[PDB]
């Protein structure tokens, strides 16, 4: 896979962010994870964690997987990086997202993220507390 440039337009919630990609505004949904909705337990914490990560980054990048790049709602589907650190993984490692929505052929980082989730669960972090 390849990292590509993007710029932050606006934080949205734990697993979605508005980015400018190839010069066009888009909503991106993070591959392979599910954060709680803002209205649910840990939802506010997941949103604040993603907000800080993307706002503080000097460089945002997106990395598409091998399969579909947009979902049925028109959201980009990608791994999002903030100064080289994957947001998707960092949420899972902190117990602020579960590994989820693992569709065959857009799942390159699945085992990396499942290892992060095992660690968060062993630490009883957040959703796993
Ligand atoms: C993460 C992901 C979500 N989706 C769709 C499945 C879910 O459909 P439904 O809306 O019908 O439940 C929805 C979950 O997104 P949210 O967790 O953002 O609600 O997004 C994909 O199609 N591909 C993906 O890789
Ligand atoms: Ca969600």
Whose structure tokens read 């990609």? 21
- Domain region containing 105: 1-129
Closest CA to 60 of 50, 68, 70: 50
What ligand 1 atom has the least distance to the C-alpha of 100? Answer: 1
Closest CA to 77 of 106, 98, 52: 106
> CA-CA-CA-CA torsion for 44, 20, 31, 121, nearest 10 degrees?
-40
> CA-CA-CA-CA torsion for 19, 42, 106, 85, nearest 10 degrees?
60
Indicate if the alpha-carbon torsion angle 36, 41, 47, 49 is positive or negative: negative
Active site residue 117: no
Secondary structure string (H, E, C) spanning the chain? CCCEEEEEEEECCCCEEEEEECCEEEEEEECCEECCCCCCCCHHHHHHHHHHHHHHCCCEEEECCCCCCECCCCCEEEEEEECCEEHHHHHHHCCCCEECCCCCCCCCCHHHHHHHHHHHHHCCCHHHC
Total domain count for the chain?
Answer: 1
> CA-CA-CA-CA torsion for 109, 56, 8, 37, nearest 10 degrees?
60
Active site residue 29: yes
Distances (CA, A) of 128 to 11, 14, 41, 78: 25, 17, 12, 25
CB of 77 within 6 A of ligand 1: the answer is yes
Experimental method: X-ray
**Tokens matching residue 34:** 């599910």
CATH code, domain carrying 100: 2.40.50.90
């Amino acid at each position: 896979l390849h990292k590509e440039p993007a710029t932050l337009i606006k934080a949205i919630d734990g697993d979605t962010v508005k980015l400018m990609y190839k010069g066009q505004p888009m909503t991106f949904r993070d591959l392979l994870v599910d954060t709680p909705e803002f209205n649910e337990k840990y939802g506010p914490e997941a949103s604040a964690f993603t907000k800080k990560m993307v706002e503080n980054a000097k460089k945002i990048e997106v990395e598409f997987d091998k399969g579909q790049r947009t979902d049925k709602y028109g959201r980009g589907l990608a791994y999002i990086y903030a100064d080289g650190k994957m947001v998707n993984e960092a949420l899972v490692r902190q117990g602020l997202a579960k590994v989820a929505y693992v569709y065959k052929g857009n799942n390159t980082h699945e085992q990396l993220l499942r290892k992060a989730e095992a660690q968060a669960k062993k630490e009883k972090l957040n959703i796993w507390s």
